[PDB]
Every structure is written in structure tokens, then in C-alpha cells.
Design a protein around this motif. Structure first.
Motif: not given
Length: 469
Positions: A39-41, A48-56, A231-241
Motif C-alpha cells: 500500500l506504500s508509495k 495491493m490493487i485499489p478496486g475503486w469500490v468506495m462504498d459498502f 499512502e500510495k493514493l495520498q494526493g490522488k483522491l478528489s475532495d469528495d472522497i
């Protein structure tokens, strides 16, 4: 029965293949570091791939969603009706994939076949036609990259496929273009790995779901992490998350311990690795998947033959050949019900022309139990490491795959290995705090449930990937 010479060989094999609790706890401990490193930079052997599912899923989603699963042989098309009450209904059709289709030289062709099969499906299922577009999710279980839920970049073909001009391209628009050409009102809105649908569809019907896991030919797990801990998504996620939002992770942890620092690899595991298509890779999968157990058995038996203990005066021409024994050999040997091991005797005679003695069959059987138990024990280290990383003290682990569903005794041994790792004292598998239970369908239901979550975000203008796309 067993003579003294064979008994000493069985005791040597017990020492090679037994993985005691302390080894399990050391494997697990190193596995938790590797999860965090992935998960680190800087990254690590576990992707450790982000699946882009951000809701339960809440369990109240309802309506008609489609899912397609592009397999080895068949294209499977699923209409999933979400009940809105933690239940769903499915309707499926299988469309065998022509022999020549896997290797076509016209890159559009495969997408035309999928859209034509969708058209026939829709014709049967919606006789009066459909007026508002139905969201679709695509289970694409080939090696791919994604930076948002509704793209999918092919990294490399697999399973015999060999189609030009698709590698390094986004496959979503290729499929969407053929759907729109035929005027079907379907929108492709998600592209997933089947393990990440396993998690999400089981969570829909069972909110104690902490993970989705496959124990098959390949091995894999997916779970929900938290975006502030990645850590590797730090600064890659827009403010609505929100920082505390969940993020489904597709671990792809078959590469765990490619550095060879903890797994209990034996002389036989080194030989399997050296004879494989890619030596040095897929180390945890080679140590824990059911796919190799007949080959492990085979090598241990060839050693005994060579050292003059067994198969004296037999012809081994048919046996002495790599991967002549698949998973169903040890499985059948473990199921042989009676003491003289008659099924094992028939198997060795009919398949290989080998006549065995009773004592030889007890060594073969005892070897097959040791090997199926080791694979079951090591295969749960990834479960324990995720639950310990995230602090899940209780929960359900949704499982799938042919080894989990069919390999004899794999379920009890996997559950008991968790028990050992954690040092639990309860005595029935049903009171264990972390339980392995049957998963819902990840390819069908799972892609449809993910399509339902993505489409709601897309509709509201919310982010579904990193800033940029």
C-alpha cells in the motif's frame, strides 16, 4: 502393517510437510508487513490493487443490473435483480466462445460477439424491449490495470487468448462501442476482478463479511481498507472522497514471499518452482494452491522409488512424467474409505500399471493427507494477516474456488489453522469468532452489485477513480 523401513520414511515425511503453529504465526507476521508495504508509495511484491469500490453495499439497493463474465470457454451473461432486502435473483445464459475466437486477428471481433450475445439475451429477457439503460459490470479476470472503476487496460492476454491491438488499451470503450452500434441501451460502468466481486456480493447478503477469498487453481483475496491508510493514493483522491471512506483492495497476494524469507519451502517445492513456466514468481500460490498437490505427491513417491523402498520391479514409464497427477489424485486417495485402500489400488493399477502392496498404499495415503493439510494451513495466513492488520476480531470470510468447495477436508483444516494461529479455545468450528462461510457469486452477482454502486456515483457526479482518469 508397516515395516520399520517404511515407517522411518513416513516419519521423515512428517517432519518435511508438517507446518506447526509457530511457523504459521511467523508467516502471518511477515504477511502483514508485506500487505502494508504494497500500500506504500514505494510498493512491494504484493500489488495491493485499489478496486475503486468506495462504498459498502447497504443491502437496500434494488433493481435490474447485468453482469458479464468472460471466461476460458464461455461468455456468461447474468441478469441480477437486487431485491432491496439483502437477497437477489439471477437469470443466466452461457454462450460458448468459438475455438477460433480466442486467437482472432481482427481486434473488433470479440467485442462484436459479446454484444451479439447481449442482444440475444435481452431479446429473451425483455420481450417488450427496455426503455431506460441498464448498468452493466464486466468481470475481466485477465491481468489488467485500472485508475477508475469504468476503465480496464489489458496488461497481457492469458489462457490462450492472443488478439492483436488490445494489450495496453482500454477495453471498456471497445465493448461499449459495439453495444451502442446495435442500439442496446446498456451502459458498461464497472470492470472488476472476480475476487473483488466475491467480497462485495457477499457483503450485500451478509454484512459480517470482512473478506472475499478464492482457493482454486489461483489464489487471491480482497477486503475493504480505508483511504487514509493507503499512502500510495495520498494526493490522488478528489475532495469528495472523505478520508475515512472505505476502499476495496484486490491484493493479488499469490506473489507473497517471492523474496523467500518465511515460507517453509522444501526440496520438493524448489523443484516445482524450477520446472514451472515462471521460476521465482507466484511463490505463495505455488505453496498453497491445490493445483500442485498431485505433482508434490509424485515427486515424493519418485524419491522413495529411487531410494529402493517402493514400487520394486514395477515399470514407471507412465508415472515418471511431470504433472501426470492433477489435484483429483490426492483428493481421491484421501476419500478412499476402507482400510486396505482399494480405490487407491485401482487408481495406481488402471492409470499407471503399477501394482502396490497395502503398506505402499498407507505411505501414499499418509503422504496425501500431509500435503492436503499443509496447503490448507498455509492458505489461511493471508486471511489472518488481513484481519490482524485491520483489527477484525470477529467476522465472516466469504470463500470460493474448487479446492475450498471440493477438496476433501480442506474446510475443517483451514478453520482449525486459524484457531492455531489465534490460539482460540472453542471446540466446534461454529463458535470460532472468525468463520469461513460459502461466498455469493463474485463473477455474476458481485459485478452487478458493483455496477449498482458505481452507477449511483456516476449519476451524482462523484469521483470513481483518481484525479485525472
Amino acid at each position: 502393517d508397516v515395516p520399520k523401513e517404511l515407517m522411518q520414511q513416513i516419519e521423515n515425511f512428517e517432519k518435511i510437510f508438517t507446518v506447526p503453529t509457530e511457523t504459521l504465526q511467523a508467516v502471518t507476521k511477515h504477511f502483514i508487513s508485506e500487505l502494508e508495504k504494497g500500500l506504500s508509495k514505494k510498493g512491494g511484491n504484493i500489488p495491493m490493487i485499489p478496486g475503486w469500490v468506495m462504498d459498502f453495499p447497504t443491502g437496500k439497493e434494488s433493481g435490474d443490473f447485468l453482469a458479464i463474465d468472460l471466461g476460458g470457454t464461455n461468455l456468461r451473461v447474468v441478469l441480477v435483480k437486487l431485491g432491496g432486502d439483502r437477497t437477489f435473483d439471477t437469470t443466466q445464459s452461457k454462450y460458448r466462445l468459438p475455438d477460433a475466437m480466442r486467437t482472432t486477428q481482427n481486434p473488433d471481433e470479440l467485442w462484436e460477439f459479446i454484444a451479439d450475445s447481449l442482444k440475444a439475451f435481452i431479446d429473451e429477457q425483455f420481450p417488450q424491449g427496455i426503455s431506460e439503460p441498464i448498468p452493466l459490470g464486466f468481470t475481466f479476470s485477465f491481468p489488467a490495470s485500472q485508475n477508475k472503476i469504468n476503465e480496464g487496460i489489458l496488461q497481457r492476454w492469458t489462457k490462450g487468448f492472443d488478439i492483436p491491438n488490445i494489450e495496453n488499451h482500454d477495453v471498456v470503450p471497445m465493448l461499449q462501442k459495439q453495444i451502442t452500434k446495435r442500439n442496446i441501451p446498456i451502459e458498461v460502468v464497472a470492470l472488476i476482478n472476480d475476487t473483488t466481486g466475491t467480497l462485495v456480493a457477499s457483503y450485500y447478503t451478509d454484512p459480517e463479511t470482512k473478506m472475499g477469498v478464492i482457493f482454486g487453481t489461483g489464489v487471491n483475496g480482497a477486503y475493504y481498507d480505508v483511504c487514509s491508510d493507503i499512502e500510495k493514493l495520498q494526493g490522488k483522491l478528489s475532495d469528495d472522497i472523505p478520508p475515512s471512506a472505505p476502499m476495496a483492495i484486490n491484493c493479488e497476494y499469490g506473489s507473497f514471499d517471492n523474496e523467500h524469507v518465511v515460507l517453509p519451502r522444501t526440496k520438493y517445492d524448489i523443484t516445482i518452482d524450477e520446472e514451472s513456466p515462471r521460476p521465482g514468481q507466484q511463490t505463495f500460490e505455488k505453496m498453497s494452491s491445490g493445483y500442485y498437490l498431485g505433482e508434490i505427491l509424485r515427486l515424493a513417491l519418485m524419491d522413495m522409488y529411487k531410494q529402493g523402498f517402493i514400487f520394486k520391479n514395477q515399470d514407471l514409464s507412465k508415472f515418471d512424467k511431470p504433472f501426470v497427477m492433477d489435484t483429483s489424485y490426492p483428493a481421491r486417495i484421501e476419500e478412499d474409505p476402507f482400510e486396505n485402500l482399494e480405490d487407491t489400488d485401482d487408481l495406481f493399477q488402471n492409470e499407471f500399471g503399477i501394482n502396490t502392496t497395502v503398506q505402499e498404499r498407507k505411505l501414499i495415503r499418509r503422504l496425501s493427507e500431509l500435503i492436503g493439510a499443509r496447503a490448507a494451513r498455509l492458505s489461511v495466513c493471508g486471511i489472518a494477516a488481513i484481519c490482524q492488520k485491520r483489527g477484525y476480531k470477529t467476522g465472516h470470510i466469504a470463500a470460493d474456488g474448487s479446492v475450498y468447495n471440493r477438496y476433501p477436508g480442506f474446510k475443517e483444516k483451514a478453520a482449525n489453522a486459524l484457531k492455531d494461529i489465534y490460539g482460540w479455545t472453542q471446540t466446534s468450528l461454529d463458535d470460532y469468532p472468525i468463520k469461513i462461510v460459502p461466498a455469493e457469486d463474485g463473477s455474476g452477482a458481485g459485478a452487478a452489485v458493483i455496477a449498482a454502486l458505481a452507477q449511483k456515483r456516476i449519476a451524482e457526479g462523484k469521483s470513481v477513480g483518481i484525479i485525472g482518469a
